[PDB]
Design brief:
The structure is a homodimer of 679-residue chains.
Chain A: E1 26-31, H1 32-46, E2 51-56, H2 71-84, E3 102-107, H3 115-127, E4 138-140, E5 146-151, E6 155-160, H4 163-172, E7 179-183, H5 192-209, H6 217-224, H7 234-245, E8 252-253, H8 254-265, H9 271-282, E9 317-318, H10 324-327, H11 357-361, E10 363-366, E11 371-374, H12 379-390, E12 408-411, E13 416-420, E14 422-427, E15 430-435, H13 442-453, E16 465-468, E17 476-479, H14 482-491, H15 493-496, E18 500-504, E19 508-511, E20 517-520, H16 523-567, H17 578-587, E21 592-593, E22 599-600, H18 616-619, H19 628-649, H20 653-677
Parallel strand pairs in A: 1-2, 1-3, 3-4
Antiparallel strand pairs in A: 5-6, 5-7, 8-9, 10-11, 12-13, 13-18, 14-15, 15-17, 16-17, 19-20, 21-22
Helix pairs in contact in A: 1-5, 7-8, 8-9, 12-20, 16-19, 16-20
Chain lengths: 679, 679
């Protein structure tokens, strides 16, 4: 699929330019005649498959400029655009929609005098500077600072382009070879060799940068609709589970996190997809996550664009939000059903936080046959309500709520709200917009305020002038003609400034506890479903804990019987073989105990492990444990452990749940403080 | 102490140029008028204390050259020499003897067109290119590729000069700040800001590079004369001891090794001094160490110069020579007397290798009142002789010997030899020199062959022509006039080519075993002194080993008594308090045992540790050890350990020594193979 350039006769297009691989192509722009020859020479070495070349010739005499001349510059810019496939990528995106993925400039013969480089960079900077940020989008031919030749271990040469590289090599590798350096300023009038070297080098590098790309009904809906309970979709669950797996207590790049997460969770989608998910989980601008479980340590996206301006995976870092473990309590980990794939086991079918994360953060998604949208709600409300269900009291009603947001929400019909921003009249014909309805991005407004200012076609402009003094808030100051101000009162200030947006609860759908796609009919319907299962699982947690305690109590009990039976001579071990002494133990009823501390009481015959245990807990004890103080202590422990077991059993599932909710409430106060403080 | 420049009117000398700190000064060389103004501007920011400036103006029209003109270049070079203080440092040295420690070039206004840079580098390369290798001796003004501004954590800017630096920062730090980049090509006609930035940056860097400098009778002789026994001087002993301390089984830079060695051995001399010592210990060219204990992994110096051409400490690496531990046997470490300083303990008073290292490698040194020189000898001879002393047979005589060398040695009077290289007449009037007397450096010959070729004053030239085809050997091919060839037969081929050097044993001095400065009167006098002490220490080693075995035998013995006394009911522990049960143990005679395994038999009263021990070896045993199989095993171990002890006691000190010599002989065969193989 070759998009082809027809209007530019002087272009020598790459064979793959404008195709699926166009992003992998470099368009070599040359300045003046000599630059071109050199380009061509470098070109011969690398092939015309991934390299295009277009010349912008000229020069003339002097370095001067006073009488102007831009008919040229304008058109030169046009060429680069058409040729590279610009005006074809949406700002903030990546390189895929372009004819060329790079732009190399060749400036030469005279002083750097790149009337180009300046212009190129300049225009790049005021037109689609988002490109200008991409790794090595912009390239420039430069000659090596030092060349190195190696005689022995093998036979090859190394070209360095700056001291740091040379120096790091000299300190870390030089010693492993016999070599001599060759400071650069040993050339006549032929950069041909050096341009060939540059290209050879560049191609060798890009061949590596670009090698690093890091019926349908069920599959889609699964990956597209969240599971109520934890509010995740498989992709997010894998990240969370992954973070819990390696202990995420200190940051690491999201680009290092993604491969780890994919590895341990056999993710079948782009590593780029995961990194995106990690970023989503960490976003914290007003209108994203009410509680971000992942901490955005870097440019993770900003309110102005809704997070598409997030930086690249290799420059940003995340970590577990300190609060995340107070929501997804570690004590429930052993209760989950970890899905099996090949011979691994991955993330749970679902997690069960102490509060319905699906209502805390909300969710949105479109899959085949099914669609969803649940706005976010105030955690503090969710809790007051979980407590109502707990004390069997009527549930209070919950209305969408956004962290850090300050507009106002109003319910019209149940299941439907209208969300308002804020616009005051600060002076006779000067309006100050101090809030936008949540999820309405700061730019989408500016864009529209700009179209009503410099009224670009469609229909007549209508703003005298607009100013933007955004601090960490939103403050657009609008000034209108006495005639337009009064026209806005007729249509309505909020409606005209697009300061209203609706919130529909008409489509709250998510997989219920047994994989079935359900459409809930109320916040409260969702909260209850969750409450019942969560309550059950708190029982499951209690049981799991009491059982370990039970086994401990059992082990100490038998250690006491044993020592007693020995101390007051009813059991003698002094001599007699192994088998005899272990069988005789089985007969007296003493259980074996494996390494997890699980007791076993049956016949260990046939093929006999860790499946049964041993009497190591008895015979492996020290001689010291037959003495008085030790034995007394042994009894003291048995009793303290029995007491520990009782005490636990005296707590209701709800007692525990609430012990957890409280802990969260504390941490959530801290979380909100820290979150606002950084704003 | 300011050496002052008088003949160069246009020089603006640094206030500290030509002083003790001259090495810390940068002489900014400028090209053309505009370069100078810019230099001056950069100069204003950094001060004239450490920066000098000299202009080489000119330009003219074109880029052409055909009719020549070098009266200029010649003199321009002269200026740089005088000004920098060149012709004043001996090749291979360092920067200390110069007026200026750096040379920065400022090239500007036109195309790089540095008629200078080329010339500068060129002349640097064919005159004292040793300088050209020093870290940042040569500097060049360059403009930043990207500037970065930081708003928040603090407030500062960062200038990057190459992608790698920017990129490493972007990936490792960017995320910790709010910042925006600023691609460079945003300037009018004023590099003034950029030149100020460069200087500011450069000064900031050099202020760090140069901050990193890493009666007398007793002190001197101690640090100057080796101790026979190990053949070291305190400095070398500290390095060896240091290497033994951290386990040197994989390489690390000698610049990382030195600080470690100094730290753990409280070295009171320059870290630069140590690095030198480490290098000396690792050298392996023909004529250095017969056995290098430290492995030279990098340019550690070459035969051609006698090792002064060694690279810098930060680029080379060492490690323990695999054989080193077969010479300095680990089992003797506990027998040494480790000197105490402050509250540490350092290296031994001396080490005691299995063979007199002082004869293997030899030594040389000059201190106050005393002087020394002991050539190297063949390890294989030293051993045959140690064995003679062992079987009480007459010692054979030993003559100096060099590893990898191939000349010939002849004794004239006892205590004096003449060492010959090798020179054959390969054709009628063509001589081929294939060996130089050991310790006669490949360059000192070439230098003298060059003075006899292009007979530079003194007296008439005498070689028709000379060729140098050195592979990993030495091959100077000399061609002489029929008249000169016959004149060389009169003076003697070897004498005329300087192919003879004497080796005097007239001054073999080193500290003897009790610190006294002794002058030995024979190789054999030295070998014997050593033999007697080494033999004693092998006894000491035997004792030390037998004692640990004894204690093991003692411990097992008492464990057996205990279990027996319990199993056949003569001792009961089942109940009774601690104190009672431990005192009753003391009465039965059972010793306590500390953590090193040393038994104690006395009353542990008063202030009672690790000074006495406990009965943990008894009571801490498992209940399992009272059963039959365990007890049987316990007896089996006691017996095997008793047998182990006996067997050891059946070996004479000599038996052990020889078991060690043999191990060495194997490793030394491997060492020689590996050493030649790499040549």
């Amino acid at each position: 699929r070759k998009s082809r350039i027809t209007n530019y006769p002087k272009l020598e297009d790459a064979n793959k330019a404008g195709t699926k691989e166009g992003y992998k192509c470099t368009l070599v722009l040359t300045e003046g005649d000599s630059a071109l020859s050199l380009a061509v020479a470098g070109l011969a070495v690398v092939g015309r498959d991934y390299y295009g070349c277009y010349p912008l010739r000229g020069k003339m005499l002097n370095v001067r400029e006073a009488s102007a001349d831009q008919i040229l510059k304008n058109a030169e810019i046009q060429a680069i655009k058409k040729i590279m496939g610009l005006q074809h990528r949406k700002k903030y995106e990546d390189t895929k929609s372009l004819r060329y993925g790079h732009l190399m400039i060749m400036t030469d013969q005279d002083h750097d005098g790149s009337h180009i480089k300046g212009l190129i960079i300049n225009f790049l900077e005021s037109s689609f500077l988002g490109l200008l940020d991409i790794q090595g989008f912009l390239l420039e031919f430069i000659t090596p600072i030092i060349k190195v030749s190696i005689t022995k271990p093998t036979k090859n040469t190394i070209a360095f382009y700056n001291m740091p590289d040379y120096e790091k090599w000299r300190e870390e590798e030089s010693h492993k070879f016999t070599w001599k350096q060759k400071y650069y300023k040993g050339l006549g009038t032929s950069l041909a060799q050096e341009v060939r070297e540059y290209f050879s080098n560049l191609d060798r590098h890009l061949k590596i940068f670009h090698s690093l790309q890091g019926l349908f009904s069920l599959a889609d809906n699964i990956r597209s609709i969240p599971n109520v309970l934890d509010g995740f979709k498989p992709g997010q669950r894998k990240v969370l589970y992954g973070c819990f797996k390696k202990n995420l207590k200190s940051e690491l790049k999201v680009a290092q996190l993604a491969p780890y997460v994919s590895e341990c969770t056999a993710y079948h989608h782009g590593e780029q997809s995961l990194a995106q998910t990690i970023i989503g989980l960490a976003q914290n601008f007003v209108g994203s996550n009410n509680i971000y479980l992942l901490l955005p340590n870097g440019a993770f996206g900003t309110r102005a664009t809704g997070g598409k301006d997030a930086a690249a995976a290799r420059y940003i870092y995340t970590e577990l939000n300190k609060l995340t473990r107070k929501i997804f309590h570690p004590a429930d980990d052993p209760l989950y059903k970890y899905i099996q794939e090949d011979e691994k086991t991955v993330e749970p079918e679902w997690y069960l936080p102490i509060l319905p994360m699906i209502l805390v953060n909300g969710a949105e998604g479109i899959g085949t046959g099914w669609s969803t949208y649940i706005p976010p709600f105030n955690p503090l409300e969710i809790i007051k309500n979980i407590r109502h269900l707990m004390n069997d009291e009527e549930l209070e009603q919950m209305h969408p709520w956004f962290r850090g947001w300050t507009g106002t929400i109003e319910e019209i019909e149940p299941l439907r709200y209208r969300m308002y921003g804020r616009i005051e009249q600060i002076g006779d014909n000067v309006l100050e917009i101090t809030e936008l309805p949540a999820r309405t991005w700061t730019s989408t407004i500016k864009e529209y305020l700009l179209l009503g200012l410099s009224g670009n076609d469609k229909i007549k402009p209508w703003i005298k002038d607009m100013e933007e003094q955004h601090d960490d808030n939103i403050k657009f100051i609008i000034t209108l003609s006495p005639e337009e101000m009064a026209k806005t009162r007729k249509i309505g200030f909020y409606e005209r400034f697009k300061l209203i947006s609706p919130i529909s609860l008409m489509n709250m759908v998510a997989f219920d506890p047994h994989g079935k796609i359900k459409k809930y009919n109320s916040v409260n319907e969702i909260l209850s479903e969750f409450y019942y299962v969560r309550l059950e699982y708190y029982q499951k947690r209690k049981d799991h804990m009491s059982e370990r305690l039970q086994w401990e109590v059992e082990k100490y009990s038998f250690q006491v019987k044993f020592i007693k039976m020995i101390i007051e001579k009813e059991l003698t071990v002094t001599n007699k073989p192994r088998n005899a002494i272990i069988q005789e133990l089985e007969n007296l009823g003493f259980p074996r105990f494996n390494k997890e501390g699980k007791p076993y009481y049956g016949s260990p015959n046939d093929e006999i492990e860790e499946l049964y245990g041993t009497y190591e807990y008895l015979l492996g004890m020290r001689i010291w444990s037959l003495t008085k103080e030790r034995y007394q202590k042994l009894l003291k422990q048995k009793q303290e452990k029995e007491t520990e077991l009782e005490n636990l059993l005296k707590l209701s599932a709800k007692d525990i749940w609430n012990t957890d909710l409280k802990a969260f409430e504390v941490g959530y106060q801290e979380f909100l403080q820290r979150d606002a403080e950084a704003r």
